[PDB]
Design a protein around this ligand. Structure first.
Ligand code: HDD
Ligand code: HDD
Ligand code: CA
Ligand code: CA
Ligand code: CA
Lengths: 673, 671, 355
């Protein structure tokens, strides 16, 4: 896809950047034990390059990972949009997607509790079109001017830069409690959507209302929804924390691996579409980025399929250097007067100057379009083009009036939706239509399962209990209470304050479909899911059972890891490196039962800790071979529990265990208030 | 110390950067539901600043933390060096120190297994002097030109950028096994030195041989050693991994807290001093940065005290922007022909152009000297001075010959040690004197305790089992076996390969003092160490027990956290947020026994897991008030296990255990 | 000077923008372009750019950050820094505020207001307001530049636009470049004038202080230097900058004929003791002394000979004694009094031909 820019070093002699063959292993010296010479250009070119390898990390979403793929349109969508990449059944457009967390710096853990980015570039035949989205459909704030306040509050305290990749400190919760617009996103981040199981098991949302614009100039309002074909799934917090230490790269590795194994993830690219006249028809303002349109009021139209199926060749060149902009817009789409979106337009063009160090960042292979470029932009540091047109001004006669102006009527220009209008004073004021900060957070909460609601309360309990200021904590309970009195009461319990009296202004009982994770049924596929098989070298029997299990499980697309004391034929991982965070389900072969009752080869109690951890975190666990009580009794796991399996028959074991993998989590193991 | 540069925003109205009062909470729009206007300069100035907040992270040592302090000279050292900061008994020089890991990016965890940076700036009355050191006294490679090879191999694989902050992958071990100079630093990194308990519980080393130069021109060869006065301590690996998730900020938080509480860490700044004639006298070449001088051959001389006692005011401005250079040298010190050192001098000047974006990085407050600057450097982006001298060239008459040249005999100039010499062909060749890559790794290994040796084998077992390539794994065994056959046998066992036959060229039995962690006796102080008291709100007796334990422990300078199901008066932390990685010792109060036998307030089994984790990780653990110890399966007769009715008897025992710090009998040994 | 970074966005309370679509865009440009010049976002921290009042805001970090901020809670709204800094606006803290009478209405358009469409009437007003010679100078600048335009079609297109402002201008510029002017097109012609835009019409200068007088002398006669010295004293008293020019430097001589040029002077005086120079030396280029006097005259400057013998200098220069702005007195005092009026007059525009 970027094949034209690739550099092959599978053969040949080392050269400088200017093609002179050289060596690079010993410095030039005055004598064998002498000082290094200034004239050693080999040394200096190589070390200068190294000294300058790094670029500024993104200001937000610094930690992330990307892949190439393809978008395919299901129809000719000319009836609703002029957009070219949507103009034909089966029409294919190359994409590049980067996923990310939000707060953390570029080496922070994938499995922090955070908002996640989901940024998609369509290299369309009428220009690059970016949808720069998140895994959560609403944002914290209602005006782009507040962006640095939010980000300052969420990032580490600036005297000591503590804590990394976390909202669990005074400043973030001070901001949330003083700025109540944040409530809706906060509730999302405190649910399982804050700790998704993988990039593949989350959705993407454009967040803002945009416009679809036909060639005749008429427009409709839309929201983007990228709906996962892998299903929605999350971690539990106490698993996430351990995972952040055991494997900071979990999400990027999961994505890389799924793509390498031929299981590249897929989304349905959907929109909600409503009329301009419905901007305030739903009990809120469609310009307000803190609100969703409940699916009951407007259903998804599936536009096409997004599949990621190709890993990058060089992470830095492709993933680190990709520079998205919501200003990368194409004919057939337009902006709205969402004051959050409005300010983003400025920010993303400006910030790339910081990252790239110069104005020619669109010339980087990953940012280049796949159609010709005709304009009078010139010069700048790092200019890679050699322009032939020596009259780069409009209007001209000396280049015969080229390039020609493009617009609604000619050259398939972008155009602002011609129905759009402005009226009134030039104001720095907030629309009173934006003022209800609480009803939609309550709607979201109502729509979770009882155990899911517990998980969310328990996340707030965790975070707020780490806030040092009593006053901030009181202010936090004040805002929570406006969403739900019960939530305030339950989180106050953990922090030894009293909740304030019920304030019912915004209370209600309504629910909406499609926002719950635990409620979304079993996963539609178990391909790529990870099964750990805990075995031993001390019994040839155990290794036999493991091999039999492997054969049967791998037939169904599961990634099987056999664990034992030491590596050898058929064993993938040692107990020393193994951890429950590494598996979606854990099986002990009964040949290995003795290990679950000391070794220099692994930390004491490791085999049993993996089983106990997996059970406590809600995963399918079991013993295969028929003798289960020694292991289960050691783990305090009840033989009759949901998602606990015990069979002698390998075929029967796997048939039951695979249902448990699709269920994914057994939530009956978590206590409720 | 940087007070002149401080900005106070505790009062006043919001202004732009040019002092015009503004607001910053709502955009300017055409109508109340209208589009944002280009003429909103309040918006654009604020968001432009934010857009440009980030600067490139350091190419290595990107993850770090810093503090201000003071160095105090013990003596007048004029008899060995001309260095002004060492020229009088009791002479004080402000310092700034940054500690770091090595491989990880910004945000990665403090408790990765890694080499650690320990970079010290002395703002002397004769210029800034930097010692840019590590916690390990030898480096991987023997020539600066190999640095990008080492770093590429150790940092994440460049197709997918995995794994973060770790040598546990094919490329690192490919390089190690192909470049055997790496063996000595590798053995250090695979020891407890790879996972120190804090910045305060590690030493600092200059690594290279440098020269001390007297005013009379004569020179001696030296090594810098910063010897911790808190003692040396490490984590265990299985604890460190969890810690990296539970608190990535563990080291920087430990440093911040120690300073805030009046317990700023101290080091004795030391040197080994030897004659120029002894360059090759110790069985290796003093120019070779992969070798130590055993303390048996050359004892340490204490020059003065380094103390850190002041946290920064703004992390970015001070810690992130501090730009160290070994080129920051002062009269009385000189370089050697160490080819690793030689190339560092180029690198650290060049690299600040990347970080700062321009040539005036020395004008940042944290980089400024504390004496006047007189030179003819001019212009450049971000120029902060207004130079009065309009004839900035030498030689001149129009500025009366100023600034004047400084040298050995005038203006206290820096001078290259005058005895230094060069001879021979201009070569890109390695000295044969560098060729022994294995003896000193074996020296180091020999000097560790039996269980220390086991930890190191187990770290290699852990990492090498993750290396996918069979051929790389075999190549690694070939190298380890040249250091020790027994090491190669023991790590080969974990990876299902056969160890190669013993090859005894570099085997020996010698030991050297001062390199072992577990062997270095109990900690000389237990101030700052963390005790978690596990209690319950369901019994008032439990809280009374915890409160009484608190009073007695805090007297002795320990940081006490009382844990229970929920927060209230006397309780610091919930079981939900508590972890054994957060404590140096764990005490259960009798009255809370029931908890160790389910709750919506914390994950199932959390209270007993803390206690069990702590025990298995080697910590002092106890019950104050056998029921608990049974449930935990912790033996009452265990070293570092405590069981006492009386709070006074308990504390007195338990504090002895905190000084011992780790009970290593809890770890299995090979064969 | 090099580092000063101006912005129209540097605005204060009591002033506001208009919807001038040129002004509007400038506001973006000057903030952005400083990133290029400075290489980073902290350009307002350069000494020449700093304000002379306290700065209170939550801008942080960036390359070249020179401040050490004490406020560790730089976000609004906060309680952890007690709500500081406080928002400033019309009603509090002397905030900037957009003029509240300001309003917008209509479609979001990339369209030009028809109110902007007269491009020619005001150029005509400007031209009408210049003096005849001044109009000739303008025509001649156009003649100079347009004759260097190589494309025939461009030159024709230029004549088209010129003709819409003034047919006479089009005809006169066209004569120099060998094309015909298009026929008169009177849509925008008029005879209106406006005050204060003319240079040559704005009367004598109000002060001659700082103006430059070159006195051309010689070392060959000790009387020439005595004359130069008398003139210097008289002229410097009135705050003129006097350069005495001779073949070589010495006490009283400021520069050599070799470095001297008419472009260096607002007026040129020859002391009649130096007449023989105006009639070869290794010390300056052939004919330099006469050339300085001839250039000065032809460029419209006051020129003169002081001492009483003028005819040899004036005749060699083809300058008429009775010319305006040509002076010839024996008396130093009388010479200076006359010459200084010529310096205020500044240029003698009768020396330039009209169409
Ligand atoms: C006005 C400032 C501001 C506001 C209000 C937004 N952000 Fe943004 N965003 C940026 C300022 C910006 C940025 C600082 O300009 C970034 C950082 C790196 C970059 O290229 O743009 C960016 C990064 C960026 C990334 C990473 C892109 C990549 O992977 O390279 C994603 C996914 C988003 N943001 C998503 C959004 C969502 C869904 C928003 C709310 C609807 C949002 N941002 C609000
Ligand atoms: C030729 C390249 C070169 C080589 C051979 C070395 N390094 Fe280095 N080091 C760098 C090039 C580098 C650098 C890339 O230039 C850094 C990164 C950021 C910086 O300011 O300098 C640096 C960072 C740096 C830091 C972080 C300083 C801070 O806290 O800001 C420390 C502590 C060290 N290194 C210490 C060492 C030691 C003890 C070495 C072996 C004796 C050594 N380096 C070899
Ligand atoms: Ca904070
Ligand atoms: Ca690798
Ligand atoms: Ca730059």
């Amino acid at each position: 896809p970027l094949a034209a820019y690739e550099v092959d070093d599978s053969t040949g002699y080392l050269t400088s950047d200017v093609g002179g063959p050289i060596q690079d292993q010993t410095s030039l010296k005055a004598g064998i034990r002498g000082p290094t010479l200034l004239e050693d250009f080999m040394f200096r070119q190589k070390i200068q390059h190294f000294d300058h390898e790094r670029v500024p990390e993104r200001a937000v979403h610094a930690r992330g990972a990307g892949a190439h793929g393809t978008f395919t349109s299901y129809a000719d969508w000319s009836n609703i949009t002029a957009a070219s990449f949507l103009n034909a059944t089966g029409k294919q457009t190359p994409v590049f997607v980067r996923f990310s967390t939000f707060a953390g710096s570029r080496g922070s853990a994938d499995t922090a509790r955070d908002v996640h980015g989901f940024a998609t570039r369509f290299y369309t035949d009428e220009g690059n079109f970016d949808i720069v989205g998140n895994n959560i459909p609403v944002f914290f704030i209602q005006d782009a001017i507040q962006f640095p306040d939010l980000i300052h509050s969420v990032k580490p305290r600036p005297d000591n830069e503590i804590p990394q990749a976390a909202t669990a400190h005074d400043s973030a919760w001070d901001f949330f409690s003083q700025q109540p617009s944040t409530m809706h996103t906060l509730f999302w981040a405190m649910s399982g959507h804050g700790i998704p199981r993988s990039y593949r098991h989350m959705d993407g949302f454009g967040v803002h209302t945009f416009r679809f614009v036909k060639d005749d100039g008429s427009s409709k309002l839309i929201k983007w929804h990228f709906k996962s074909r892998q299903g929605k799934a999350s971690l539990v917090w106490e698993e996430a924390q351990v995972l952040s230490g055991k494997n900071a790269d979990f999400h990027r590795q999961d994505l890389w691996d799924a793509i390498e194994s031929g299981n590249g993830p897929e989304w349905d690219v959907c929109v909600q579409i409503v009329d301009e006249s419905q901007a305030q028809a739903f009990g809120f303002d469609l310009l307000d980025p803190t609100k969703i349109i409940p699916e009951e009021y407007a259903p998804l139209t599936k536009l096409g399929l997004l599949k990621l199926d190709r890993n990058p060749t060089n992470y830095f060149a492709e993933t680190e250097q990709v520079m998205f902009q919501p200003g990368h817009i194409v004919r057939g789409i337009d902006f709205t007067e969402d004051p959050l979106l409005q300010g983003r337009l400025f920010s993303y063009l400006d910030t790339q100057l910081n990252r790239n160090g110069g104005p020619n960042f669109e010339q980087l292979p990953i940012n280049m379009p796949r159609v010709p470029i005709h304009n009078n932009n010139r010069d700048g540091a790092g200019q890679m083009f050699i322009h032939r047109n020596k009259y780069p001004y409009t209007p001209n006669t000396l280049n015969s009036g080229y390039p020609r102006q493009a617009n609604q009527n000619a050259g398939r220009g972008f155009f602002t939706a011609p129905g759009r209008t402005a009226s009134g004073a030039l104001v720095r004021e907030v629309s009173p239509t934006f003022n209800d900060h609480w009803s939609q957070p309550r709607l979201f909460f109502n729509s979770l399962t009882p155990v899911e609601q517990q998980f969310l309360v328990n996340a707030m309990r965790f975070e707020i209990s780490l806030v040092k200021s009593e006053e901030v904590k009181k202010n936090v309970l004040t805002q929570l209470n406006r969403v739900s009195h019960d939530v305030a009461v339950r989180v106050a319990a953990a922090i030894g304050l009293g909740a304030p009296d019920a304030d019912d202004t915004y209370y209600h009982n309504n629910k909406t479909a499609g926002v719950s994770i635990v409620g979304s049924g079993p996963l539609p596929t178990i391909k790529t899911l990870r099964v750990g098989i805990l075995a031993t070298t001390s019994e040839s029997s155990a290794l036999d059972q493991a091999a039999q299990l492997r054969t049967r499980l791998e037939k169904d697309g599961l990634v099987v890891t056999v664990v034992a004391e030491t590596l050898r034929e058929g064993v993938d991982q040692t107990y020393s490196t193994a951890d429950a965070t590494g598996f979606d389900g854990v099986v002990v072969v009964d040949g290995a039962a003795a290990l679950f009752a000391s070794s220099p080869l692994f930390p004491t109690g490791r085999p049993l800790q993996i089983f106990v951890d997996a059970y406590r975190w809600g995963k399918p666990v079991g013993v295969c071979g028929g003798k289960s009580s020694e292991v289960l009794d050691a783990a305090d796991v009840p033989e009759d529990g949901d998602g606990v399996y015990s069979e002698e028959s390998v075929d029967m074991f796997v048939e039951e265990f695979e249902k448990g993998l699709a269920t994914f989590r057994f939530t009956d193991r978590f206590a409720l208030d």
